[model samples]
Target: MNIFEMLRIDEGLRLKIYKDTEGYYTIGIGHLLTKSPSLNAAKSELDKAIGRNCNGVITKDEAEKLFNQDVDAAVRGILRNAKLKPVYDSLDAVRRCAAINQVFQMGETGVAGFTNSLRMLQQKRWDEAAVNLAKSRWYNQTPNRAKRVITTFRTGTWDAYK
Candidate 1:
């Protein structure tokens, strides 16, 4: 499936393709370095190009420009560097989470609780994360984030949230 289709976004919101300096076309969402999946992947690619071009010390603007100029080749370069894979993977997760958050209605309190839970999880305090996740609600949906937390507690993953 197309990436936007996977995210369930309308075709109107699909990214526009642009021709870069490398004689190839690429698509990006919003700003070049925004955290959509393609751009996140592009950022990883740009980082490698920066390493090669500036001995690992390029400015953000430069990276953005290079990424926009040749995102496909940049992504190819990033794929050659095994170390960048985890960074890209993490970015993908973050992008997915952000998309999900935008689609669901989590009010201020609910978002606060979810943030706390994520923080606790990052700190390796799984129990606390579980608790906070449970306390949070869906601001719009009848079944809330709490239900997702419960499923995670049982299944050891937040797959139910999807």
Candidate 2:
């Protein structure tokens, strides 16, 4: 599966606004609403992104579109981040997607904080990178998801999620 498909499974779809594990109001495959400072603002942003009057209930297609947009932003943010770019560029396709997945969950800065892990990944020390990531709060907060990503890093295959 591709990045979008992988994220769809990783995030799961929610047409209605719901609190995520961390209690943030989120919609449409983890598109966080808390960043807007107000629920109304977040809803309007969602409406603009989907190009429809969602009124808190978005369609499946709209969800997919929003997810793609979010993924694109995460991917772009990773590429533009000076600390992450070279490490990201040095990774294989599967590992690149794994990094992108991490960025989508956290921000690029969050992933970049994994200094030893980033260096290990950059050096293509897959197991060390995976182990290093496992020591993070990101892993502690979302062990199952982190495991899938770590498996991808360790094996360099898309099979972890599939």
The candidate that wins on TM-score is: 2
Tens digit of per-residue lDDT, candidate 1, span 1-162: 222332223111213333332323333321232233464455455455445433223454553445344434434443453443333343334332332332222322334335555455455465665565555334234344435434444344436545
Among all windows of 10 consecutive residues in model 2, the one with the lowest summed lDDT is 33-42
Q: How do all models score by TM-score?
A: 0.28, 0.91
Clashes of 2: 0
Model 1: how far is 70 from its true place, Å?
A: 27
Q: What TM-score would you give candidate 1 relative to the actual structure?
A: 0.28
- In model 1, residue pairs whose N, Cα or C atoms come closer than 3 Å (at least 3 residues apart or on different chains), thus clashing, are none
Please provide, for model 2 over 23-135, each residue's C-alpha lDDT reduced to its tens digit, 9 standing for 90 to 100: 77789898887764567877787677677788878888777777878999999999899999999999889888888998999998788888998999999998788888899
Query: What Cα-based lDDT does every candidate model obtain?
Result: 0.38, 0.85
Clashes of each: 0, 0
